[PDB]
Design a binder for this molecule. Sequence first.
Ligand SMILES: O=c1[nH]cc(-c2cc(-c3cc(Cl)cc(OCc4cccc(F)c4)c3)c(=O)n(-c3cccnc3)c2)c(=O)[nH]1
Lengths: 300, 290
Amino acid sequence: SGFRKMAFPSGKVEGCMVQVTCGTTTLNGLWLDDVVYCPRHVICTSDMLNPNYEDLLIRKSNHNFLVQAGNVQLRVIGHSMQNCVLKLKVDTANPKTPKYKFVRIQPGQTFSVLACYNGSPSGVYQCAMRPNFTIKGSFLNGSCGSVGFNIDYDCVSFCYMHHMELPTGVHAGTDLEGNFYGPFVDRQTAQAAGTDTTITVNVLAWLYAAVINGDRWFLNRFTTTLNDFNLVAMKYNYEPLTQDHVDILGPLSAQTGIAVLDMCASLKELLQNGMNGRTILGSALLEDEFTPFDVVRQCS
Amino acid sequence: SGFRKMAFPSGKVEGCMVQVTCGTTTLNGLWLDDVVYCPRHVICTSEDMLNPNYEDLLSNHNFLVQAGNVQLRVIGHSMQNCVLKLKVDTANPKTPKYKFVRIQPGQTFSVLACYNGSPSGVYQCAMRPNFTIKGSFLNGSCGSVGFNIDCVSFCYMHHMELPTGVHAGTDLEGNFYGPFVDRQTAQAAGTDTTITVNVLAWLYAAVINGDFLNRFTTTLNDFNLVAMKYNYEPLTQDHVLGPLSAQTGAVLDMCASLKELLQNGRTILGSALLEDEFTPFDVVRQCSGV
Ligand SMILES: O=c1[nH]cc(-c2cc(-c3cc(Cl)cc(OCc4cccc(F)c4)c3)c(=O)n(-c3cccnc3)c2)c(=O)[nH]1
């Protein structure tokens, strides 16, 4: 029993976090082999409104960049820009380097965040990419260059680098290839984010997790087509559910014997009725930061 | 900005996890220097687990210790309270600076759940006032540890799941938290209560995050009255936590607000019910970047 928003063991990322300085500007970098990855606005100053990143990089030498892995000063022997990520060639290969990959993730995916300051981790926590491509993280100034990731066996899938906090208090960033998620740019101009919606297929996976752990108070005797569920779920700002979603919910239907569409009916009623004083897996709201894969890993 | 339930980095602790096998019983152990700590109920058979006599049940060779794909040679075994100690040939080189502490209820900590010696994930808990923790554990997770980092301060080692889905365990000296024993029998938690000082500290984390306050200051005596009705631990003068109101300016006003929230009853920092698993030291710790 039990159900908590658990992150992966951060150990394999902790061994990669270094500190990157360029003039007056200090933030975190990720050290994999002989390359350190960090946000490119490390070269900016307060260049915030309309930075010309190529112009600013041209005026840098290798030794403009202080790389610092704990007590050691790494030596920068090369650098280039790939989209919004900076890539620094150091002369020593990180021996703590894990087996890893870079992966772009679609909204709804979950990942762990290791929030660092100065190359020092401060905490870990679990996060979902919102449909509007943002993340409701816990980030202070100094946070940039922190990373999101999944562990799969002993291979680390890196999927997020943190670049900025938006005026609303939510956070934006890039894959490790330097391409932003969502329609954002690393510059201090007005850039609004699309409306946020509940991640429907995660709420459904959560309902199954509640049933796996012994609770069925929310079910009912109704079912629904997939279209009538979407017509209702949208009015609560719920993402559409697709046939794809319904398929990956397959294995959870099997373990419970409750058919996905039947469980959509349950969700339908919960949006209509509320909790009525009750809780589900400890919460009094419907919870959308767990994917079907997370539910399968933690519950069984 | 933002507030999440955050766990300490776990790498220092991942390096100390190992598997311990006795009979068909497998579970997790804690490898520090040349000692491996785990639960004494790893010597029991299921038939033994009904009414165990540990002293009598307790040779070396019958202890398979597995660090990764390395076998630790067991050269000595002994018991301290409800914990088993296994001396091994070789000290763990990844031994961090550490120490065994014992935490009070209302204190929070991190759990690195494990299976067959392999860290599966980490999360932030609180020691419930009824001395249980609401963690997330399957069979095979016995021996996972709770801890804080400051130096790793191990405070918890997981032993059993109670019938209600909650979990009970010991400190690393083998003393149980709460009124429980390590044998399969009839045991259930005492009625539980909400950690009042932590709800206030969480209401503070929201306020300094842009989130319900109340102009109608109450007094300490008047509040506990409200609190006892609603199953809240009484608020002491120690719980008065100065550094959080001095950083956002009112203490009995926050009590005034909580006192009102309980009666009337939207959401705060994205929870619909009042959260009591953040300590005031957590709140500063998170909103400070240490
Ligand atoms: O030496 C350092 N220097 C800079 C930072 C830094 C920089 C940013 C940042 C970066 C860019 Cl490219 C643009 C930016 O405008 C955001 C904005 C503001 C107003 C309207 C708007 F549309 C967008 C901020 C930033 O967000 N953060 C930050 C703060 C809190 C939480 N996480 C990230 C930190 C740092 O840590 N170290």
